[PDB]
Design an enzyme around this catalytic site. Structure first.
Site, PDB file in Angstrom:
ATOM      1  N   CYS A   1       0.915  -1.111  -0.003  1.00 54.66           N
ATOM      2  CA  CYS A   1       0.012   0.026  -0.014  1.00 54.66           C
ATOM      3  C   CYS A   1       0.794   1.084  -0.091  1.00 54.66           C
ATOM      4  O   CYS A   1       2.068   1.057  -0.278  1.00 54.66           O
ATOM      5  CB  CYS A   1      -0.818   0.030   1.233  1.00 54.66           C
TER       6      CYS A   1
ATOM      7  N   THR B   1       0.897   1.103   6.777  1.00 51.36           N
ATOM      8  CA  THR B   1       0.433   1.438   8.266  1.00 51.36           C
ATOM      9  C   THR B   1      -1.096   1.055   8.359  1.00 51.36           C
ATOM     10  O   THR B   1      -1.188   0.564   9.479  1.00 51.36           O
ATOM     11  CB  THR B   1       0.550   2.881   8.510  1.00 51.36           C
ATOM     12  N   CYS B   2      -1.748   0.815   7.209  1.00 49.77           N
ATOM     13  CA  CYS B   2      -3.293   0.580   7.266  1.00 49.77           C
ATOM     14  C   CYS B   2      -3.489  -0.734   6.557  1.00 49.77           C
ATOM     15  O   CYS B   2      -3.747  -1.778   7.027  1.00 49.77           O
ATOM     16  CB  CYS B   2      -4.235   1.544   6.991  1.00 49.77           C
ATOM     17  N   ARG B   3      -3.802  -0.546   5.329  1.00 46.30           N
ATOM     18  CA  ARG B   3      -4.104  -1.733   4.335  1.00 46.30           C
ATOM     19  C   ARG B   3      -3.400  -2.888   4.304  1.00 46.30           C
ATOM     20  O   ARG B   3      -3.917  -4.015   4.519  1.00 46.30           O
ATOM     21  CB  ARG B   3      -4.450  -1.016   3.134  1.00 46.30           C
TER      22      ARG B   3
ATOM     23  N   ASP C   1      -7.764   4.116   0.487  1.00 46.56           N
ATOM     24  CA  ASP C   1      -7.093   4.384   1.557  1.00 46.56           C
ATOM     25  C   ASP C   1      -7.990   4.630   2.980  1.00 46.56           C
ATOM     26  O   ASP C   1      -8.708   5.556   2.707  1.00 46.56           O
ATOM     27  CB  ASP C   1      -6.061   5.375   1.448  1.00 46.56           C
TER      28      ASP C   1
END
Length: 151
Positions: A7, A11-13, A118
């Site tokens: 990504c 940090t997220c996906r 995102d």
């Protein structure tokens, strides 16, 4: 095989995808190696609190440190699954000739054009929607990976 989820920030996906898929893979009895990285990631970063909380709700621990995508990772991966078509583009501009191993997650699993958008900066509910979106794709991925010889 070696699978990497990619990504922007890592940090997220992609950390959510990695943790969700590792869990799914071990239940399905899949023998795969799973990692994640980001096209604009820092190292030492962590998964965002909302990403952690979203997985924690489903009893999965997201203890993650951000990693930049590197040439070494790109060379060694058998499959690189990007969240968006723009991620594919960045992968192509910054690294080697690896188009043949890079696909969006939606492309590869569903055959259709589509991005995993995102969730960063969004509420916990935005993250939980991303989590659920990822879960459904990753369950299908697992079933599909069974169709791969030398898996």
């Amino acid at each position: 095989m070696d699978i990497i989820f990619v990504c922007t920030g890592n940090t997220c996906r992609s950390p959510m995808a990695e943790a969700l898929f590792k869990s799914i893979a071990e239940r399905e009895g899949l023998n795969v190696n799973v990692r994640s990285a980001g096209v604009f990631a820092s190292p030492n970063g962590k998964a965002t609190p909302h990403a952690v909380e979203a997985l924690f709700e489903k009893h999965i621990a997201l203890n993650h440190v951000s990693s930049p995508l590197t040439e070494e990772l790109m060379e060694s991966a058998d499959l690189v699954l990007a969240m968006t078509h723009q991620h594919k583009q960045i992968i192509a501009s910054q690294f080697g000739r690896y188009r043949d191993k890079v696909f969006t997650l939606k492309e590869y699993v569903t055959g259709s054009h589509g991005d995993v958008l995102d969730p960063f900066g969004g509420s916990i509910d935005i993250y939980k929607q991303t989590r659920d979106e990822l879960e459904e794709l990753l369950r299908q991925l697992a079933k599909q990976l069974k169709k791969d010889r030398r898996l």
